[PDB]
Amino acid sequence: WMPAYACQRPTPLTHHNTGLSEALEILAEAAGFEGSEGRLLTFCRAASVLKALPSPVTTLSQLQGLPHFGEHSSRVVQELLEHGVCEEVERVRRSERYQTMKLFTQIFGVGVKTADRWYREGLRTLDDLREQPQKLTQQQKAGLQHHQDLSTPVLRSDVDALQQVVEEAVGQALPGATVTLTGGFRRGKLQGHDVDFLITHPKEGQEAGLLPRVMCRLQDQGLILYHQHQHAFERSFCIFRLPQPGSWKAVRVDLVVAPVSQFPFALLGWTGSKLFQRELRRFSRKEKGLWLNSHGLFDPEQKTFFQAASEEDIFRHLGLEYLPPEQRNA
Ligand SMILES: Nc1ncnc2c1ncn2[C@@H]1O[C@H](COP(=O)(O)OP(=O)(O)OP(=O)(O)O)[C@@H](O)[C@H]1O
Ligand SMILES: [Mn+2]
Ligand SMILES: [Mn+2]
Q1: CATH assignment of the domain containing 270
Q2: How far apart are CA 117 and CA 71, in angstroms?
Q3: Which residues bind Mg(2+)?
Q4: Closest ligand to the CA of 192
Q5: Rounded to an integer, what distance in angstroms lies between the CA atom of residue 22 and that of residue 25?
Q6: Annotated catalytic residue 127
Q7: Quick one: which of 153, 151, 114, 150 has its CA closest to 132?
């Protein structure tokens, strides 16, 4: 009754199974920390099925017929229904390995391989990292400097203020250039870990050199704490200093520039969710023989690229019913 791929079904922002999906996602995350990519994807998929259900799962009977609910994920839900707690999940939560890997990987500029390296070298705390500055990139140093603020959920109100200053800077640098909110906030999330913006201009090539001008403008207003510009799309992964009444908050902001020919692919890729996009790309390759990414949709047999004006165009070309961003919360 429910389709196998996350991109074939709506997944709304709010759902009836948050306890169960959260528990499965702890196990997915822990698997990724150990390099167990298959196990990660398996738990992620099961959690996403629960998100798409129209009712709470009260009894294990309601598991019947559902895709991606193998033995292990079923046992986890069974323990939660019967005992209110799953021993395996609680052991993961209490473990020093999991707690440390979560601590490190949530730092700006730190991935799983870096976090694991540090773990294996005997580092455990944020102070441990500050004691070894030669082990840190400039990005990671900035992440540590602002870690309290960067751990604080970003709110819709923060997003609105940030979009205003980014739009002002973009508009003053280049009349006609546009700013589009992407990421989780485009999917309707009330809170997030950063804010993602996609910048373009309707005339191909007019976007050249725009981002550095935008950054200069923001820097001169005192709004930038950290900036790493990289000429993949031109992008700037930043920490903004967001003014607030009587104080200020550091906030992570990703700015991406795409040429307008690629904008639909970029918007689709950058809107997520991460699992939704993984599933959409797996679907495109496996079911339709096409390779999808943030730049385009390629037929490797014909050596052709699909011309899309909208996300809707891309869904249609892949034979999928269109899902608006708020239904991509897989
Ligand atoms: N810094 C980044 N580097 C690479 N890709 C990114 C980055 N930020 C966003 N994306 C892309 O945009 C989508 C959103 O990514 P992001 O990590 O911001 O998660 P999110 O869905 O916005 O949720 P939240 O940011 O609240 O955790 C993903 O599909 C990803 O491909
Ligand atoms: Mn985001
Ligand atoms: Mn981001």
Answers
A1: 3.30.210.10
A2: 32
A3: 194, 196, 254
A4: 1
A5: 5
A6: no
A7: 114
List CB-based neighbours of ion ligand 2 within 5 Å. 183, 194, 196
Shortest-distance ligand to the CA of residue 195: 2
CA distance readout (Å), 12 to 9, 183, 184, 243, 326: 10, 15, 12, 32, 6
Parent domain of 143: 96-152
Structure tokens at 14: 């709010």
220 catalytic per annotation: no
**Helix and strand totals (H; E) in the chain:** 15, 10
| CA atoms within a 13 Å half-sphere pointing along the CA-CB vector of 80 | 22
Ligand 1 atom showing the smallest separation from residue 237 Cα: 1
Determination technique for this entry: X-ray
Q: How far is the CA of 61 from the centre of ligand 3 (A)?
A: 39
If one counts the domains in the chain, the total is: 4
Centre a 10 Å sphere on the Cβ of residue 179 and count the other Cβ atoms it contains. Answer: 19
